Design a protein around this ligand. Sequence first.
Ligand SMILES: O=c1[nH]c(=O)n(COCCO)c(O)c1Cc1cccc(OCc2ccccc2)c1
Ligand SMILES: O=c1[nH]c(=O)n(COCCO)c(O)c1Cc1cccc(OCc2ccccc2)c1
Ligand SMILES: O=c1[nH]c(=O)n(COCCO)c(O)c1Cc1cccc(OCc2ccccc2)c1
Ligand SMILES: O=c1[nH]c(=O)n(COCCO)c(O)c1Cc1cccc(OCc2ccccc2)c1
Ligand SMILES: O=c1[nH]c(=O)n(COCCO)c(O)c1Cc1cccc(OCc2ccccc2)c1
Ligand SMILES: O=c1[nH]c(=O)n(COCCO)c(O)c1Cc1cccc(OCc2ccccc2)c1
Ligand SMILES: [K+]
Ligand SMILES: [K+]
Ligand SMILES: [K+]
Lengths: 250, 247, 250, 250, 245, 251
Amino acid sequence: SDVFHLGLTKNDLQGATLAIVPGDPDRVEKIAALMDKPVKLASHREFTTWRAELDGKPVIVCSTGIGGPSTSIAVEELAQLGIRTFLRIGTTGAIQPHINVGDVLVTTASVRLDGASLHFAPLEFPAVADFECTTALVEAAKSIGATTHVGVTASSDTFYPGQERYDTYSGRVVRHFKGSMEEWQAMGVMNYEMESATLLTMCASQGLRAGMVAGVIVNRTQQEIPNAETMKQTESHAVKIVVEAARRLL
Amino acid sequence: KSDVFHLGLTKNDLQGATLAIVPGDPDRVEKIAALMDKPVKLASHREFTTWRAELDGKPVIVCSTGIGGPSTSIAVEELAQLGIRTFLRIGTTGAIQPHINVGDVLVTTASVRLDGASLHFAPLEFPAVADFECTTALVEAAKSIGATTHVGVTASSDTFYPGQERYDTYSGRVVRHFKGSMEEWQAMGVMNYEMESATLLTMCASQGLRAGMVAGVIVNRTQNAETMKQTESHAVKIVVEAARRLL
Amino acid sequence: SDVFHLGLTKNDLQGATLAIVPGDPDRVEKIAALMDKPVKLASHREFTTWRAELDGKPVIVCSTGIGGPSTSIAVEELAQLGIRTFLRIGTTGAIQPHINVGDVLVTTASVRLDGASLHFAPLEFPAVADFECTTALVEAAKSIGATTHVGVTASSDTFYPGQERYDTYSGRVVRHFKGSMEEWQAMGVMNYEMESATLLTMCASQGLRAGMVAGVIVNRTQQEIPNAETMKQTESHAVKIVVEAARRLL
Amino acid sequence: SDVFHLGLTKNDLQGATLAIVPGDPDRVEKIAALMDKPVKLASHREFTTWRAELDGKPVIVCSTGIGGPSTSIAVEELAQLGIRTFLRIGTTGAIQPHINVGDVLVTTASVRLDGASLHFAPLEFPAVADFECTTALVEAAKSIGATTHVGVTASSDTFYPGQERYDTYSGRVVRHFKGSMEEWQAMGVMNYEMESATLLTMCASQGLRAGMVAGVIVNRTQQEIPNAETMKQTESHAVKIVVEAARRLL
Amino acid sequence: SDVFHLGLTKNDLQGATLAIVPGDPDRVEKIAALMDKPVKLASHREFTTWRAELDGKPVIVCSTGIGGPSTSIAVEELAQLGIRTFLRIGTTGAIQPHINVGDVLVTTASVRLDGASLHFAPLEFPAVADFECTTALVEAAKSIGATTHVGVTASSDTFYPGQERYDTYSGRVVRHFKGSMEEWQAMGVMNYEMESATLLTMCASQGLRAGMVAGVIVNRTQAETMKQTESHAVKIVVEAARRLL
Amino acid sequence: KSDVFHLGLTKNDLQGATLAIVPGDPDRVEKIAALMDKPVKLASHREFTTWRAELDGKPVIVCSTGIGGPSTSIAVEELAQLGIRTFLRIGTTGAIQPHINVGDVLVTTASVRLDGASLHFAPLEFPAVADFECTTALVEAAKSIGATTHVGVTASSDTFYPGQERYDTYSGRVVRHFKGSMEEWQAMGVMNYEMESATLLTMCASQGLRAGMVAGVIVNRTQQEIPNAETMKQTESHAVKIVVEAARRLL
Ligand SMILES: O=c1[nH]c(=O)n(COCCO)c(O)c1Cc1cccc(OCc2ccccc2)c1
Ligand SMILES: O=c1[nH]c(=O)n(COCCO)c(O)c1Cc1cccc(OCc2ccccc2)c1
Ligand SMILES: O=c1[nH]c(=O)n(COCCO)c(O)c1Cc1cccc(OCc2ccccc2)c1
Ligand SMILES: O=c1[nH]c(=O)n(COCCO)c(O)c1Cc1cccc(OCc2ccccc2)c1
Ligand SMILES: O=c1[nH]c(=O)n(COCCO)c(O)c1Cc1cccc(OCc2ccccc2)c1
Ligand SMILES: O=c1[nH]c(=O)n(COCCO)c(O)c1Cc1cccc(OCc2ccccc2)c1
Ligand SMILES: [K+]
Ligand SMILES: [K+]
Ligand SMILES: [K+]
């Protein structure tokens, strides 16, 4: 292995410069199966890597795990191995009333409610997505025909207090995050997730291209629990979009 | 006499216009408006000069903001009250990357917030990001007229001198916070310096308004009078062509 | 010209070391007319410059515009040309019930609700006026006989949200500035304006003398819309004080 | 399941109130095997859970993954299920010249170079370990006879820039973290890891008991590559200490 | 004198490496009297210094005054003279309902509501007590038989607004501290005092050992017992010093 | 016996006094009070010593604050509760400008806030500014007795050592934040270092109380590190005469 965590060599990639980066290790195979000649490379901790082919060109699929810290490890080590373009796909909870479950969201930039992004750039630096990657995702969503929303995402280091959840062990939220959801809502923020602030900041400040797409599985203004059947269809919809976007970026 | 506090305009003056081009210089307002059909002056107060014109049978507004976030925030807020929903900024800039030449055109995706006024609308963690439709329109308009274009991040400062790390000043010193800042921005891939985009993009993105940013390079910090005039005409043609696609 | 923005040479000043700095470019001609031998020097962007004579000594009047950014340009370039003393004249809105419309205010120091001051000194540094300039303004106010208050001013980078105005397009104020006016009121702050924080900080941290005087045109506890008759008389009253103060500082 | 991520019910725990929380899902079986009646419960994403018995009392072992974010999900959902005491075991890189590879470190408190801790308490709040937990670990290390150091730990949201590593894709470190290692060294900080700031802050501010122990696999002042032989013995040493400390806290 | 403020030479210490550091200059004699052969060395400003014998070993008692600033002067100058272990004793106001007047509190670490700690380490650094010192204080509390609580302390640069007191001249508390007591209460913070954050931070970041113990004289949620509580706590800090010689 | 928590004073003890001179050293209180008519000792508790005197037929208070903002904030609050409305501080200082000499007098217009206590009264953006009437009286009194006076900005630190960039210490190190800080304040025109002005001026200006600050230079940091004990004695007596004369103008 040429790297500390992923368990991969330069030869394993076979000249790949683009990677799709989901959060769940168990979802890596499903994405790679949509492309040609899928093969397993490695699995260590939360990092599972598969290789595939797209229009005769090698492509990587690699899981990051939950959160900025493990995402920062995966992105750095993939960059060392030659990756220059990163496309993230994940699940999300919407905070706007007009956004429904099953909708697809493309992130232009993120609210930095994380710690890892500060290790690459000061807070004043924008957590902005690459223009070519964002274009490819919006065009891919229109190609397959989905309800799409484009805008700002709130990216939090926690699932609970940072997203103003009160049904917890303590039942309390620290002063800084008290009434924060209502503030983001008024500012036009679409949704909550946990990795995009880190990914977009670290790529934009290091000459790497990054894009972000997500499927809505819950709306915070309507309900609190997701549905099992609709989630699988929504995940399938978002996967098709990210693969189609990767096609345009090769 | 007036519906607003500073601009001196009524809703009737706009004639249903929802788009506005916002330069910094009051003197350059006439020049932009003359490129479009039926140009007419409306008001001239302080640093704010407003002109109305017609683009493809649709009314468009041109209004100067002056230098800096404070007066930009006054102009944008008062124009939004009058019915404007789309704002397109055009200005001059100094490039900090060696590959970007004088005469090049730059489109801003988002800005580094080295200003104060942006914080009056959203906390620092909120991204000073441009609208996707506006950015697309500006990029496609630049390709239409044929120009050397660079797309990326811009540093937006509340000063011209210390915040942009200039040492040829009265004091000859730069405060600790900004010492070595230019080298840091350069390493992070930041294209250029200007003085208004962070305020404009933050206030628009956090209030449901569409904003875009385009600039012409007149100097490179790592390295002519007539070349500055040609660069302005090149950039002005792009912002008008982009406005056509957004109507 | 020897400067980037103002369009002036060192010769145009003719040995001048003091400058009166208003905000409105249209007000420059009125202030210069009060002094002997007025002449137009330059007009570029928001910067209009006039040269006059006071007691046989050359004096400059130069507009800064609204806000710290353009003010920082004007002051720096004037300092390069030889100016060592700066006196600001402007309008203001009072936040104290005991201060009435028509009163004159002299600022000792300012609350830094701006960005430009930070480009010259860290936040812990006081935005304080020069003692000789402040004494000259107070004694000039007593010379003409006007109701004067001396104290602290809040200096904001915006006209609307930073001064807690809710009659706007969005009708919202960001968390940081919510309830800020009530806090400044309890702390004894007299008024709101938009330039003093930048001017006083940049001068005090660079060895330049600076003073600040203002006329109250509106009271926030009483009304919102100003007048026409009383505004003109207050602006004529305050201008007299700033010229009289310049006589003492020459 | 009673929770969102772990895939566990309250009855699965069988009355357990203590959990050992490693980072690596693969290390869970190895810790559980030291105790009586070890059995698998669930495996979802980076969260693997096993149940065992210690002196006739049920105990839980659950993986957190790398980083504060996934750690915060695991700790919260375990607290919902009845866990009140948390003991972390991990690997670390030492930054003091007097600490040898193979040594064991017990953390009294942590430097907060993370984001997640801020979602529970403001920066001024100490990321401090529980006194009873710290005592148990120190006495357990004395029991088996290991070389032990007790003190402060630096806890970072990144593996690379936040720990001032320069052998990377960019080869640069952001201004904030430039020269930071030398600063921590002078302040007597022992080591770098990635989860203790989150764990200790979130427990101390919510009435939960937490302790932290680690085995040194590399010294940053000596070499940059860990020895893949003594590492197995070091991790075996640290596991024995955490299990013996758990015995004392039942 | 070998120092700027304290008025002491290295010879005055007679080889002492441990110091008990109260806030009150008038309480220095009272603490020393519990040990053998106490003698006054110096009295300058708010710094009163006595030396005594404990189990045949010399021990220093030196007042710091109220607040981080004067504390930082005393600790630094004592370190120059050879002191390596510092044990603080004081009074406190509890903010938890379960802690009674007369109880004894041992601080593991402190909430940094002070300015002086920042002059030694950035805010992210923990104001944590030394493990050996904390252990000795807990064991000494059991030795005399007190009702003891161990945990986190809020350390403030003011007595009034920083501790959310509204019975003042202004009757107001700045926004930053409005509702702060309730927040600390929910986070399990035991009490308020004015020096621990400075002491613990400056010692932990400079290789010096420090411990903190206090007697509860008032409960914020709720003369006679005030003197008894102080006598109880002083006995503990001297007994703790015995185990650290 | 006492109307306050710390000072050990009743409102009746003040006899109608509204002005207080506030030094740092408890042992310097008697020296200032001896300059005025009918001096009497009221109380001595902790670092707080209080004397009462008469000035031009009007009662005046002298009360020590101790070193640092924390104890200063206690003294000021409890004196205000007893009716004091005007505060004048006197102390010793170390100059950081080459042109300021030992024996000079400094009057502070406003202070750089390198303290913690000031934040408990107003956010950092609020200026630590002195009262205009108090400042005017201090400058005029200095010219009255004839002294070399400088008016400007003071750096007010929560420590004596690292916050004032002293390296001759036990550790020999200064935290990143304050490394190179003295050179920065020097370039910005800051006159000197002391330890209480930021707290005093902020808390008074934000609560409707009048405050003034004056100090005597006993050391210059660019010239030396250890003050001459003979010159300190003379400078102290010089500064005390000014603060009493300034108090006369404000009654
Ligand atoms: O609100 C959310 N915030 C987020 O940050 N994310 C993104 O994934 C983070 C790790 O789960 C996310 O996705 C959601 C949506 C959501 C709501 C409730 C419970 C969720 O979790 C797992 C689960 C439990 C039961 C059935 C299906 C899924 C997810
Ligand atoms: O470096 C820059 N930073 C900027 O923020 N801007 C943007 O305009 C801000 C107000 O001028 C900007 O454009 C430049 C480029 C530049 C370099 C040197 C001098 C400049 O000033 C005005 C000028 C001087 C002489 C002839 C024409 C214009 C502008
Ligand atoms: O509340 C104020 N805050 C301020 O910061 N300033 C200072 O001028 C900033 C530039 O406008 C200021 O002056 C005022 C008073 C005021 C209130 C309402 C409208 C104002 O604007 C211009 C106007 C409109 C209608 C009639 C006369 C003047 C000014
Ligand atoms: O310096 C460190 N910082 C840390 O934060 N951690 C803690 O684990 C975090 C996830 O690896 C940790 O442990 C170390 C020690 C270290 C140094 C170099 C490479 C390392 O990585 C994995 C590995 C690769 C090859 C052989 C053994 C271990 C670990
Ligand atoms: O609430 C407190 N906060 C604290 O920071 N401290 C610590 O001592 C700091 C200086 O008193 C502390 O101890 C207390 C307890 C307390 C409450 C009310 C009055 C107090 O003051 C002195 C006094 C007044 C009247 C009778 C006896 C003692 C002390
Ligand atoms: O540099 C200084 N910074 C200050 O903050 N102060 C103000 O007094 C604070 C408590 O000493 C202050 O005064 C000085 C001048 C100074 C320098 C070295 C030693 C000093 O202390 C007492 C002393 C010791 C030996 C001979 C004479 C005086 C005072
Ligand atoms: K993870
Ligand atoms: K302007
Ligand atoms: K003190």
